Amino acid sequence: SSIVNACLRYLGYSKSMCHEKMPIFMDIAFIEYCFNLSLSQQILWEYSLISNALERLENIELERQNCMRLLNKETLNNEALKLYSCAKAGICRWMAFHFLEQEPIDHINFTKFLQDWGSHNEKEMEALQRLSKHKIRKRLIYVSQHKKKMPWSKFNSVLSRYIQCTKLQLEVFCDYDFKQ
Amino acid sequence: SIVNACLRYLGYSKSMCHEKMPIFMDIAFIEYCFNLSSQQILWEYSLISNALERLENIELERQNCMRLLNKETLNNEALKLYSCAKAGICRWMAFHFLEQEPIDHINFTKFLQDWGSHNEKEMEALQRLSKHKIRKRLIYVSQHKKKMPWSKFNSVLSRYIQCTKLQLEVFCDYDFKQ
């Protein structure tokens, strides 16, 4: 469909849209696509990719925050806070897992990733220090009992409910609509 | 796909309403509209006038951008092709106008608003014939739509495009390949 290849060619490659604001629904749709939000892990874990995704997630959180300025969607607000913090913490957790599984461990990117996205959390991450550098064999199943501790299914749920909650609040309070 | 979100931007966002529309979009629109790859063309005066406006936009952009080597040739070739293609499109659209009964004749007469270039025999011949009764135009067109079947204008348009994106690809900073 050259008449759509034209549109993508504009967005990815045109002067007027390089330096232009990117609206929230693009980042929403990006999250939905990236994490396959639907009613199970074809997620691509790369620190470039995941950091980008977390950046758009954060972007959504900020727009949601600022835009929130009888109903009491305070409840929706605090709900969205719970969901966001647990979702982001989860994504960073699983990304850390994916970093760990590889041998040798690229640990400067690892630590960096945990200094950009692991500060909304606590200090159990020092635990990660000492498991940053014990040897792989004890660790991979020190790590892999955790997906029946915290299977991805539940973070898929948390993310999906963060999104639907978010675009609910936005659709109701603010002048937003999402259906074609 | 979820590509529609991107489409949702273009069709529906404040920042993209009042914004420049590039030439390759009008190119792709022409190629698509006339199925450049035998009349699955949709002749409705809004559509055809818009399409002709994009065609005109391409001609102007090509013209202005065209401001050892002789692209005198590419230029005048593109001129012939543009004028004959547009004249053809306006002709066929006038035909589709005539075939309908009754005739929305004021949109017809003025149809040649920018499209009805001022060579006045094409059209005064075209319209004296505005209101004899219907068979005359239906077999006047069906006399004329095996005069110059659409295939030939498909060819003319396709080489107008191919010529155009050639000249633009070479001299100026253009690319059309993903």
Binding site: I3, D175 | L7, L10, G11, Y12, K14, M16, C17, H18, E19, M21, M25, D26, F29, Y32, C33, Q40, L42, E44, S46, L47, N50, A51, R54
Partner: peptide, 29 residues
């Protein structure tokens, strides 16, 4: 433009895409 005020679709892109779907759903049936 008084159509941005009114939250209305008014763009060369919009005219394009809409023309696109008139042609394409002319095709479909």
């Amino acid at each position: 433009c008084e159509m941005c005020r009114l939250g209305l679709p008014h763009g060369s892109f919009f005219e394009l895409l809409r023309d696109w779907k008139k042609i394409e759903e002319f095709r479909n049936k």
